[PDB]
Amino acid sequence: AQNPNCNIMIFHPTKEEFNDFDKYIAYMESQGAHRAGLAKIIPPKEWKARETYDNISEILIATPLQQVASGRAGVFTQYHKKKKAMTVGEYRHLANSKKYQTPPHQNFEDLERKYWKNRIYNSPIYGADISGSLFDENTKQWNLGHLGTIQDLLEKECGVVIEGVNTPYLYFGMWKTTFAWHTEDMDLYSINYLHLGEPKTWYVVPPEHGQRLERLARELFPGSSRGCGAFLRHKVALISPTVLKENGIPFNRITQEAGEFMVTFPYGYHAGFNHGFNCAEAINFATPRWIDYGKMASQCSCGEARVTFSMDAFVRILQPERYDLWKRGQD
């Protein structure tokens, strides 16, 4: 069995190996990369996503989100308070202000210590989930707006044509912006490219151990768990590495830098934080190996999780018994 300790693997594809996206995902899996839940892909030195980032300031962040925490430093939830619209140039100036800028630090480990000690005492503002792309149309390799769609994969595997579309999203971050513990919608893959700026630290639980994280979360968030049998779908709960280690939960950590891709694998729980002003692009995707995970994915039906149009068909075809209850949650 490849990668039996479920370590995060780092890949360096050549320019020739960078041509065929599907083939390279399957290669990484042949080496056991999915057992970690997360892999890093460093593009060949010949590749670029676009020519420059000098002309992005006029992108609008229509609904910036202030991430307000409740709880204790290692075990907390966050809610998102909507703020007034601002441009990317306005948001960058805000991120660099004395109130929001990254503090002085020695290295990534010192900054990680400061994040976990202090995060709850501040409310950073995140530009998340903005439909769009920063890849140039002429970038032919690993262009996240030109991937094979999940609807086409379901049709190729199962024979059924379905409605829906699959497009990328932009994330503009600042110091202490946080992504809560989650797996993807329908336990899909994700791919994330860090276009510019400061790093992103990730934490991940191997897919084979995801239910250990779920049991801890039910213990640590007992009101939320009574409310919803899949409350981590709400994407609000944070648990620190120290707390995970105290409770024997298997996990790994890695820091992504500008110019790097990360891939999350089906049912790989992940969480993390941004080091300072940055911009990432991400999209969900599927492969043949996903179908079995999609059929078994948990679902939130309490009303909270509320998701895209395109998840309807995935539930309806892969999970027909759950469909009626899930759709009640959506309405």
Ligand SMILES: O=C(O)CNC(=O)C(=O)O
């Ligand atoms: O970058 C973020 O805020 C969160 N990203 C993801 O969870 C992802 O790419 O799957």
Ligand SMILES: [Mg+2]
């Ligand atoms: Mg612009």
Ligand code: NI
């Ligand atoms: Ni994710």
Ligand SMILES: [Zn+2]
């Ligand atoms: Zn729910």
